[PDB]
């Protein structure tokens, strides 16, 4: 039997189509995973190929929780640590944020989405260490989900990395994942530090996870990611009434004949709820919105809000706090 919940599939389809039409976007995808089994509860694309599984994107800012997790898991970084977040150069390349802060602690790096801050956490590790971590999340790895034409994505071998590449990969450029691989990677945060396999068949046996970080680290990162959907966070549009939601926003410039252009974006929103003990992961991407905004929060946040809130109601999960 399929693991797909037709009520969630219908909800995802309606909300995705409403957003793609409203933002006059080229395409989009929604994935809903069971946060503790890796079963696919919903998987919808705009008409055409199964982009969720066939197409690879640069994850951009939705990659940031992973270097943050690795830094905390190493014991080299504490959540309360502060970093110099001023723009800086690696040879002729600039690493910078859209909004400059001289310093941010780890919660601020997550809340505000600091490329600089994330890069300073990656830079404490060797290229081999960071490659091994990305490989352990499934980047560049076949999921064997059961879909044909499944992308493995791209993870360049660390032996070829220029120092600028380690930095940009930490904030999601210079490596590529499908949306299904990115939703899968988030099971490291939801399943107490173990990466789950993904499947669209109902599970009969407990999936065997692979340990990537400590359960204590996963719990701390989920707490940090709630800041994204609260006041001051980039993902406040994705807040769900009656729950705490851990999430990450990303807006990525697209690559046109090897150059990043400022008039073409991919908007991504990924999150999980209830934040402290999540039941589901919801991943949304909308390709080239052209009307009514282009930022993750405004384009994909509302899709995430409706799909996550609707999914929790369908699965019979009670709100953990009074509604407002
Ligand atoms: C996360 O997604 C962040 N997005 C960016 O920083 C965007 N940056 C890029 O597209 N970008 C392209 C390629 N390179 C060289 C490898 C870069 O260094 C690079 O940064 C971005 C910046 C400005 C824009 O106007 C649009 C996109 C952060 N995400 C958002 C968000 O969630 O939407 C933010 C709250 C802050 S930037």
CATH number, domain with residue 131: 3.40.710.10
- Long-range pairs for 26-30: beta carbons < 8 A, 24 or more residues apart: 26/287, 26/288, 27/51, 27/286, 27/287, 27/288, 28/284, 28/285, 28/286, 28/287, 28/303, 29/179, 29/283, 29/284, 29/285, 30/282, 30/283, 30/284, 30/303, 30/307
The resolution, in Å, is 1.8
- With a 6 A CB cut-off, is 168 part of the ligand 1 pocket? yes
Taking alpha carbons only, the member of 59, 49, 54 closest to residue 150 is: 54
What total of structural domains would you count in the chain?
A: 1
In the reported structure, the alpha carbon of residue 144 is separated from the centroid of ligand 1 by a whole-number distance in angstroms of 31
**Could you identify the atom of ligand 1 that is nearest to the CA of residue 93?**
15
- Method used experimentally: X-ray
In the reported structure, the alpha carbon of residue 253 is separated from the centroid of ligand 1 by a whole-number distance in angstroms of 7
How many angstroms separate the CA atoms of 185 and 187, rounded? 5
19 cis-preceded (ω within 30 degrees of 0): no
How many angstroms separate the CA atoms of 313 and 306, rounded? 11
Domain housing 199: 1-324
Catalytic site includes residue 61: yes
Question: 105-134 burial, b for 16+ CB within 10 Å, e for fewer?
Answer: bbbbbbbbbbbbbbbbbbbebebeebbebb
Four-residue CA torsion sign, 287, 306, 251, 246: negative
Q: How many CA atoms does the CB half-sphere of 117 hold within 13 Å?
A: 29
């Amino acid at each position: 039997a399929l693991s797909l919940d037709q009520r969630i599939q219908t909800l995802a389809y309606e909300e995705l189509n409403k957003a793609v039409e409203y933002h006059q976007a080229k395409a989009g995808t929604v994935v809903v995973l069971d946060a503790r089994t890796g079963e696919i509860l919903a998987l919808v694309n705009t008409p055409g190929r199964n982009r969720a599984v066939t197409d690879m994107i640069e994850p951009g800012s939705v990659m940031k929780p992973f270097p943050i997790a690795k830094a905390l898991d190493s014991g080299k970084v504490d959540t309360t640590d502060t970093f110099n977040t001023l723009p800086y150069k690696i040879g002729p390349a600039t690493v910078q944020d859209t909004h400059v802060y001289p310093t941010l602690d780890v919660r601020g790096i997550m809340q505000k989405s600091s490329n600089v801050g994330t890069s300073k956490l990656s830079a404490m590790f060797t290229p081999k260490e960071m490659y091994d971590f990305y490989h352990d999340l499934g980047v560049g790895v076949r999921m064997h989900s059961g879909f044909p034409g499944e992308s493995a994505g791209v993870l360049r071998n660390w032996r070829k990395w220029r120092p600028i590449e380690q930095a940009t990969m930490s904030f999601g450029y210079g490596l590529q994942l499908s949306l299904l691989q990115l939703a899968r990677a988030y099971t490291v945060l939801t399943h107490d530090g173990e990466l789950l396999p993904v499947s669209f068949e109902k599970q009969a046996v407990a999936p065997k996870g692979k340990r990537v970080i400590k359960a204590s680290t996963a719990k701390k990162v989920r707490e940090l990611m709630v800041s994204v959907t609260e006041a001051g966070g980039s993902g406040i549009a994705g807040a769900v009434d009656g729950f705490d939601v851990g999430a990450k926003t990303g807006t990525a410039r697209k690559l046109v004949n090897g150059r990043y252009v400022d008039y073409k974006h991919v908007a991504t929103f990924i999150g999980f709820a209830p934040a402290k003990n999540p039941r589901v992961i919801v991943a949304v991407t909308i390709d080239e919105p052209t009307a009514n905004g282009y930022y993750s929060g405004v384009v994909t946040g509302p899709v995430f809000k409706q799909v996550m809130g609707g999914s929790l109601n369908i699965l019979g999960v009670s709100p953990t706090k009074p509604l407002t």
